[model samples]
Target: SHMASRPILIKNFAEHYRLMSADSDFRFSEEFEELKHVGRDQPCTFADLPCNRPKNRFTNILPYDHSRFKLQPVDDDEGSDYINANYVPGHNSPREFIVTQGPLHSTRDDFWRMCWESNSRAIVMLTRCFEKGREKCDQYWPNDTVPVFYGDIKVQILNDSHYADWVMTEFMLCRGSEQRILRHFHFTTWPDFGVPNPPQTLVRFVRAFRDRIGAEQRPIVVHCSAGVGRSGTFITLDRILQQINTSDYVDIFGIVYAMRKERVWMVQTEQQYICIHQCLLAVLEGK
Candidate 1:
């Protein structure tokens, strides 16, 4: 039975790739529009929270559970607050992650609070501090000589290493005498609304970071400007690579579909979707 099913699996994978390639020109706008309406029928309690403003949020995407890893008040009178982020589980591994937006100057504290509270040890940043003269993400971390305080948490960069396609920084986080090491990986090659070409740099970047954080249990945090487009592309590639690691068959569409179900607008553009296929093909060819 197993031998007989191999051809069928290969056939499905090829069909899925063909369909995805056909949608390359347009990015499947209609399907994305339909996905936009998936959760509109329900109440979004956090969408309108005063602290979560229009600029910081993607109105259609909200975290499914408020009590789970929701940022809490560091002191009394903090009032109701919401941060633009959600916890998403990994596809082929037990790894968990938090997908979120680049911190606005306003939400910088909240961002670190989420990090500290969630005990996140790694952050995968997919956008730059500025893109094409526009502010994509605030510089949330401190410079080498100074320490930045986010609520009760204090953060200081201990080391920063720049590479051809990415930057790796080690951060020391402390709160009330408790301290932890945080690794920040920033992939510099990706542009907003586009996909990385010749994805070997990105592949290496993810693998290097995963190995660096070996055996850590906390969710790895990932974000782009709006927390979807480039973020989704990075995530889809990670999951696809993970699937290919242990299985004989792959389901790209099923993985992308499952991602959108977790958070709207995952794997945003057609180019991005097609990039996933290309990346996988390169991996298979290499093997």
Candidate 2:
């Protein structure tokens, strides 16, 4: 959910070095030094000033209604809308959402609406680092009658130095009534800054998801804090890489343009594009 916030760029190495020196203490902690518990190690200040905060901001269309996650319903007929309502806080009534993820911190009713819309019929949960131990947040809605689900891809903290833990979980979902197809992804600690690009991790996640689900005639719903950024990046890279593999050479700009059409600056940073490019090339090489 917090992924919605714009990226914070490191302007200079001085701050990083300082922070590296004060590795034990983060941000502000003068009291430790005053207490004589720590030496005069300079603290790491990410920003002397908040520069590189891209002024060209892009607002995410959150709760990304799984129904809208259509993937050429006609030509490929591969995917339709997976979730129902987009979980719009203000619009689409109160309970019409299909896939429930966070960015704006909406109500549980909105999340329920999404589940109903997705025809989930049952609930399956998975937890990544963020969602970990936060199961209580969801236990508030024990709509037991909806049907029972399972958590097949639940892990504490999975990292390949380049991706989120959810990317590592093997999950699957399909249409079922008596049986449920559910998975939960939890997140705990806040994401750190300046981590390696999570390209391979993302690719693995997508491939695993596709393989797990078998095939989705409906749009698959995915949400994180903001329902963009990490979530959007996942979707974008999957789509772009698929196109690239099917075609000869890819028009990377054209692909990015399409994403911008849906959500401006969804792929704003050069680093993100590079990550995708590296992953795509790796996958192409069967790595």
Candidate 3:
């Protein structure tokens, strides 16, 4: 005899997003605060080590163990297995997005290695290398004039094209004879905590990217400097956009709440959390 299956609380997310309208009482800030305590027991012991600590761009931003994306151990680098990244689920696949910070001078090799090993087809970079006269991220890739050798892999820039809100560059990574094509999407308009003015900008931007993604593709890599703020906000929206039209329900709260369990501060600010609702409403209004 078989037993009955247990289901999580599945709500009508279509109505849910609709009800979140200001006309209704679904306040974004209060709702976002609820996500703060999603998972209490998760820990990141590896990132705290003296050796691994230097590799992290931020002191407090770390990846949890259970949901962490691990790297193959290097020869004698004990914690070379660690990187400041997490495997966050998307609508298409369980491990759909690899959310991580921008590569530091020390971790550029590991960054490319993760790309090669994970078989990711795309990388969505949400920050410019320098912002506000500060070095938000280190330029890790090469230009047409300069090819870069990152540890074991050799990277070549095939082409670069610019757009109003974003830029697209083609990269090819090779190790001797083995090679792979990498599509790099750099979205420059979104500032750190700077949500787009009309909101449709973000909506359409993600849809363009979302249209090309396939479930069969390996996880898409997304990152910013600290890897949690704009990276998390972009990913949260990327997920719901993929989910909105297909499913009757959307789980924005549950989505970021689940993301927070994997990494420390996904969707970093409450205002960015609000941006998700505004962006989703833009999608709903368009339909």
Clashes of each: 1, 37, 2
Lowest lDDT block of 10, candidate 3: 1-10
lDDT of 2 at 62: 25
Better of 2 and 3 by TM-score: 3
Model number with the top lDDT: 3
Runs of candidate 1 exceeding 4 Å displacement: 1-42, 54-69, 74-81, 92-95
Residue 155, candidate 3: C-alpha displacement in angstroms: 1.1
Which stretches of model 2 miss by more than 4 angstroms? Answer: 1-106, 120-164, 167-180, 183-191, 195-198
Error of 1 at 218 (Å): 1.0
The order by descending TM-score is 3, 1, 2
Q: What TM-score do all the candidates reach, one by one? A: 0.83, 0.46, 0.89
Q: Give a tens-digit lDDT track for model 3, residues 1-287.
A: 11111111224433555555555445656677777765546877888888898988988788888877889898888788988888887777779889889999789889988888888878889898987788887888885647789999888888888888888888888977899988888888875446777777777678767774545469899998899878888888887777755766566777787788777788888878878877876676663
Better of 1 and 2 by lDDT: 1
**Taking the tens digit of each residue's C-alpha lDDT, what string does model 1 give over 45-100?**
66556655453545655554432236665465343346777666576343477888
Per-residue error (Å), model 2, residue 126: 11
Q: What TM-score number comes out for model 2?
A: 0.46
Alpha-carbon local distance difference test for all models? 0.70, 0.35, 0.78
Clashing pairs in 1: 27-270
**Candidate 2 global CA lDDT score:** 0.35
Tens-place lDDT per residue, model 2, 2-120, is 22221212232234335623644443132212222111132212111132111111122321222232211234322222221232111112222122344122234334334434543
